[PDB]
Each structure stands twice: as structure tokens, then as C-alpha cells.
Amino acid sequence: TAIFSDRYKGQRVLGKGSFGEVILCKDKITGQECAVKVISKRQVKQKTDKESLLREVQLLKQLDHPNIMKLYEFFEDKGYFYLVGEVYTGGELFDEIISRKRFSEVDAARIIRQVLSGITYMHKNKIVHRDLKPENLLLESKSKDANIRIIDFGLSTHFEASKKMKDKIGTAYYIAPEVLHGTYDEKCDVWSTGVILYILLSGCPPFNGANEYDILKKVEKGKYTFELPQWKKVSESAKDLIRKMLTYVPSMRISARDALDHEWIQTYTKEQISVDVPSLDNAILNIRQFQGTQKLAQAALLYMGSKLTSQDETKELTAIFHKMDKNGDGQLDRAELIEGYKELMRMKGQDASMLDASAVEHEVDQVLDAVDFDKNGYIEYSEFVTVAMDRKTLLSRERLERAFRMFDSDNSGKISSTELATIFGVSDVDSETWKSVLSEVDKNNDGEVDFDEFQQMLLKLCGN
Template sequence: MGIFTSKPLPKPKPNPYARREPPESMTPVETPRRKPNPPPSPAKHLMAALLRRHASVKPNAAEIPEGEEEAGLNKSFGLSKKFTSKFEIGEVVGRGHFGYTCSAIAKKGDLKAHKLAVKIIPKSKMTTAVAIEDVRREVKILRALACHPNLARFHDAFEDSDNVYIVMELCEGGELLDKILERGGKFTEDHARTIIVQILNVVAFCHLQGVIHRDIKPENFLFSTKDEDSPVKAIDFGLSDIIRPDQKLNEIVGSAYYVAPEVLRRSYGTEADIWSIGVIAYILLCGSRPFWARTESGIFRSVLKASPRFDDDPWPSSSSESKDFVRCLLCKDPGRRISAAQALCHPWLRDHEKVKLQLDVHVFRPMRAYMRSSPLRRAALRALSKVLKADELYYLEKQFGLLNPDANGGITLETIKMALMRSATDAMKESQILDFLEPLNALGYRKMHRDEFCAAALRVHQMEIVDGWEERARSAYAIFEKDGNRAILIQDLASELGLSPTVPIHAVLQEHIRHSDGKLTLQGFLRLLHTLHPCSPAKTP
């Protein structure tokens, strides 16, 4: 599914998403659909990339003529051909742009007499190599992640000459989108929290494995049963991919109202899923969409430029924790956006009974930089770690505990690998996370204890956008002055900052070193901190 492929919302239902405008300006709520002739817009080239993905709409008719497909496509998936002997197809329970889902009954085997769901993808729809690879990857990812309780359980996949069949758990409670419509969009904070916790549980697990969903939206979360306390299950990994921790993707995929700004800029990682969860959280808590426009290009402009509003009802009466939580998810800078594991440690969620804390791959990014840093940089980080707030420490201490079950011990490269292997799937192996840990090899010979871990794993860029950063930075500098500051030459500072030792650079750095004793000034200290965790450069496959 792409930006234009989500199904329209039922027209008779109330409009929970609409901006609070005069009635005459309100429009029916629909997730944008594929259109044969999309209107001209600044995002036209982005839309065209999506439309070409499955060749279902032809922005250039000369590329893929009507009724034809790319030559030489191999539509054999190596799956079992025994679907019809094992399952009896029932009624259609859902339709997507490239396939449909039916109920089914298992006729034999361990699942005999069980009611299941079967996603049927016609091979006639697979008119491009990209479409075929999407199906292969979906089956591979579902097979790898099948164990998570908040993911619709994958049972098996089959094929014949006409279709691919993906056999899944049947969730009979309906879509989260339907629940939103039934309630007029507004959920209580407690109910919204219960849903968001479960979404984050499964997304944190996916991100640990190196899987990015890329189409997080209410339609892709189902309730297992019709019970009020039914668990929430993620579905539809048709746009998902396996990504290395240091990799950036550039394909424009997703659904318009939920797409992250960095996706539109064509350089993104797992943080894009977190943005989409933030949009869902905003909708659940207030019944409106945070980014809205009448056209696809308008939606994109709003996502890129606008800020979510928290001054309209019911936000003034909402808890400060819920508003802070949504802001943390909808941070436009992906380098400063909180991760799924961090979100589960946020004060609004962390005491919820359904929280399942996950190891966060994001802690290894600053740790890699720390292990490569000079003693001066490490001293600056240790000073900053001493002014962390309780909420920031809570997350880091939880991560330390996941890496080292022995609370009194230190972590080593071996304990890190053991912690990862406890949750490892085939997807994690493909995401090459163990190779990403190579800069931590020094921990094969020594231990890193709690205090050092908190310094090594903190994300400076996130701290810089929190209220009171200047005061905290000054407090950290005072600690650094006492415990870690030392004389440094300008050429050494330039090297620390990764700058070429030229005369103009030396002139810029003069204010970073005190003339009286050759030690770092406050500006130099901040500059040093700022280089510790720069946003990673885009890396595409």
C-alpha cells in the first residue's frame, strides 16, 4: 500500500479527524486514494515514485502500457502448493489495493477446525519486480516476527499459479480506525494509553530486529476480539523493510496523513514509524488530525512546515504528560525524536501494566561515538550525565538493566551480545546489528559500569531541545571545570571537532579556548558536546 491506496472511511460515520472549522469548510474524511490524474503540486515527483511502485497507475503510459508488465518476471516464491488441501476459504473480510483478506477454516493439521485469516495476493497484480520483492519480503518478515503477542500471528504462506496466500491469525474485533469512528474520535487518556502502549510494544520489537514498518496507521491495527480489553495486533507488513542501524532509506512510501517529514525528504530510518505513532496518539487524544489539508500536496506541506496545535479543546484539559508525550513523537528532527523504547519509558506510559520494555538499538549509536572519543570528550559526557533529569535516567537505567541482568556488575561486549540474542530473530541477523557493534570491541577487555553507561548512551541532541537546557549545560560545565577540563591546543581542538587545521578554522576556535590557561570555555565545552552525536549521514542501499 502507498500514500494513495488506503481505503476511504465510511461516509455515514461522523468526522473525527477534521480540523475544527466552520461546517461549510468540512470535507468527508478519507485517507487519500490513488488518483489517475493527481493535481499538480510541489510533491508531484514524490507521488509519481509511489505510483510507479506497483504500476497500478501510470504517470507515464509509455513506461508500462495498459495490460502489460515488466518482461521476465519470476513469480515463483518457492512456497508450498498445498493451500487448497489444507484450508477452506470463507467470506471476504477486507480488501486492499493489491489483494484481499478472507476468513478460512483449517481442514487438517495442528490448526484443524480453527478459524483463520488468509491474505490473498493475485499474481496478476504483481506487474513489477518491486511488487514481487515486496511480497517476498513481507513473507520473510512475518515469518521472522511471528512470536510477538501484538502482531497478528503468522502461520504459513502458500502459492499456486494465480495467487500467494498468507495464513494469519483472524482478528475479529475490527480495525482501530473503526473504533475511532465509533467513538467520534475522542478516547479517554487511559484508553488511548492502553492502545498506544501496545502499538509501541510491537514497534519497539520490530525496530530491535531491524524491521521498519513504513505504513503505521489506524487501519493496520486490529483488535483481536470484540471485548473491551481486547489486545491490539499489528498487520500489513507489505511495505516493511529490514534496515541496518546505520542505513537510511529513500523510497517514498506510507500513507499521507501519517508520513514523516524525513520520508518526504527521502532520507529516513526507523524514526519515521515513531512519527506515525505520534499522529495516531494525537488523533486518539483529541479526535483531530495534527496535519490536515484538502490536497495531497497540502498535506505534505503541513507535515513539513506546520506544528501540531495543543490550544484547542480538549487539549487544555489534557494532562501535561500526554501533551509532552505527543510532542516528543512529533518532533520534526528525527535525530531528536524519541525512540519506541524511550517512548515506553515516558512518564505518561511507563507505569502501565502492558508496557514490555525492549532493548533499544539507539543506545549503541552514541556508545559507538563514546568509545571512539578522546579522554576530553568522555570527560565532557560524564559531566553532562551528572545533570540528567530523573526521566532521562530512568530510560538509561532500564537499558543498562536489559544489557546486564546483574545489577551490581558492568556490561561487556559479551553481555551486550547475549542480551541481543535473547530477542534475536532471522530479521536481526539480516540487519547486521552485530557488525554495527564493532566499535564496542574494547568492551571485550573491560567492563562499563552504570555511571559510564549513562554518559556513553545519552543523546545530546535530544537534551538540547528540552526546556532549561542552557542552565543544565552551565551546571555540567561547572562539573567539567572541576573534574575534566584541561589545557588543549587549538590544533588539537580542531582535530577533536573533526575540522581541518587551517588558519580560518583557528580563528573561529579562538573563543573556545581561554587565553589565561588554555582550557575550554563554556562555548568550547558546548561545541565539543554538540559533535558527540551528530545526525548520521544518509546511507542508502
């Protein structure tokens, strides 16, 4: 058996995805950079057996298509699976799209043709995505012309998805109805793609609602409409493909492969025949609203999660250090700080960035250097822990402020309670619950909160 960390060193965290963290890693010999998805066996249950997982992995490694993330290597130890793939630096598609000021059916067809091309290839090889959504569409690089790379093709079959809301934000919009009821095949990926297309041309989800369950209720009925004013600007051809992708009964839904031949794809992907190319201004602005909303809700939930973790870890670390403190003087040396922090990781295991003893030593060293000025031998375990725990908080609180600022597009400094409803509905915090909380933060408020007030609301919503 091969050991992951004998071959790769963790450089930095790329983000948090379905089933676990993705870490930028580097081969310790060749220097090749890779994006490693680390799946915690304790947080993510397997659906299949080891036989079946290894076969899929072995197949996946052999597949090559320009629109599918390349898998290079697969590792397993006691506590995790490590999926090693190519790293892409262009970010999520929609985050790129909202940075444009011009966006047309030609742009959308370029995009969707890639997606369908990737899907078609994977379906030929009898791999289904099932959880296809905009997060799973990355851009190869930061270029304008960058190819799309679909991530996470095949994992859904072998791993059971988190039931935590922080992990399933914006899943409901894209799931095919047959997935909800249990009998599904590869046509579910066409539906998901159709939802994404609808969004690209209108900037609104076709199936929408105030909370996760209302969205699902709409999905399951399967009814949607084109009566939004911004569809008047959209080709009939595009709407036709949409209807075919959003066909309820899977045996009647267009295949990925056939979707590629559809008139709309054939017409709007000719690099030069731009016969009518208006820019879909309303759509792009709806998408920017949509995206900012999703990202703020996500950030709020991870903020609350981080605050709950730091309660847990602070107490556990203190108890570990306390017991290591044989003097009772409240001081410890470096090796002991490292040992307890490893003992913490021994227990916690939510920290894929600490892939070996070498990662731990350096985090501890970041903190001991950060202890401002240094006396060597006898260190006040109390303050360490304060600062060691106070990293992650602000790191996930920075993102909160960033996301608040990004959502507040008119730079008003505040969020209206209408907007709060939308954000909390998306985050699935019950309506009565968040208003009670508001009322306690600012007893005088007039239907809007600034960043600090919003933050105070979140703290109350995670039991502080």
C-alpha cells in the same frame, strides 16, 4: 511447491486491505480458521527480489509478540501471493473507540503502550512498518479489554503500494516526512504513532487539509499546534511525548523503546492510579466525525470502482457466453455458464474469493438458484449475467447506503454541500468537477443532497 487451495478453502471475504483482499479461510483438514491476505501479482509490483522476500517471510513466521499479527504460512502461485495469518474479530480500533461514550488519557495510553510495545519488538528485529495507520490496528476480539494487533508489518518493504485513491484514503495523515523524500528508517513508525496519539487525544489530525496534496504539504513542513480548545484538558506529559514522536529530524525523534519509558506512559497505564481522569468528550466526537467521513469517502470510491468493474465484466461475460452459444438461441447449460465464468476469472483476476473451481461452481449455483424458478438444461445467458453481475453492485451499494446513514448522524436524511466538500476533498475528486455534477442531478438544489442524489452524483462521476 505447496498449493494454497489444497490446504485452505475460502469461507468469505473479511475485507479489502493494503495490497489486496483478506479472505477468511479454513484448513481443509484441521479446521483452523485463518485470515489470508491475497496479493495480486498483476496489481501489486514487487520492490525486492524473491530471495529477499522469502527471507523476510521466514523471519516473520518466527516472530511472536502479542501486539503483532501472527503470520503462519506463505504461498505463491503464478498470479498471487497468499499470506496466511491469524484471524481477529474485534474490528478496527477507531470503530471500537467511537462506540464508547467515555474515553480518557488512560484509555489512550493503554492503546498507545500496546502499539509502542509491538513496534519496539519489530524494530529490534529490523522490521519497519512504514504505512502505520489506524486501519492497521485491529482488536483481537470484540471484548472491551481486547489486545491490539498491528497488521501489515513488513509488507511495505517488498511491495509497491497502489496509486489508486480508493487504496490510499487516509494514508497522507500518517506518513513521516522522511518517507516522502526517500531516506527513512524505523523512526518513521514512531512519527506515525505520534500522529495516531494526537488524534486519540484531540480527534483531529495534526496535519490536515482539503485534499491529499495539501495534507502532504503540511506533513512535509512538519508544523502542528496544540491550540485547539480540547488540548486544555490534556496532560502536559502527553503533549511532551507527542512533540518527541513528531520531531522532524529522525535522529532527534524518540525511539519506540524510549517512548515506552516516557512519564506519560508510565503514569496513565497504572491500572489503578487514576488521579485525574476526565473524559475527553470533544475528542471522541471529533474522532466519530473523522471516522464517518473517512468511511464514507472510502465507500464512495469503492462504489464507483464497483460500477466500473460491472461495466467491464458484464460486457466481457456476455461476449464469452455469446461465443459459447453455438446454437445462437441465447441459452446455455450449467457447465458452460461455469466455464465462461471461470474464463472470466481467467481474465479478470480481481476475485480472490473464487480461490478454486469449487468456489466458482457455488457462486454460479447461488445465481442459478437465484434465477428464481428453474428449468434444467437450457438457461437464458442474458438474465444470468444480469443477476451474476448484480450481486457485487448492491453488495458494494449496501455499504454505500450504510455509510451514508452512518455519516448522517443527526438523521437529517441529507448531506450539506459543506460536508460534500469535505467528503470529496478526502476522496480527491476535484472541486469544480463534483459541483458541475450536482448541478446536473438537481438543477434546483439548495446546498444539500439526500442519499439518492448523492448516489446519482457518484454515477455521473464514474462516467454514467
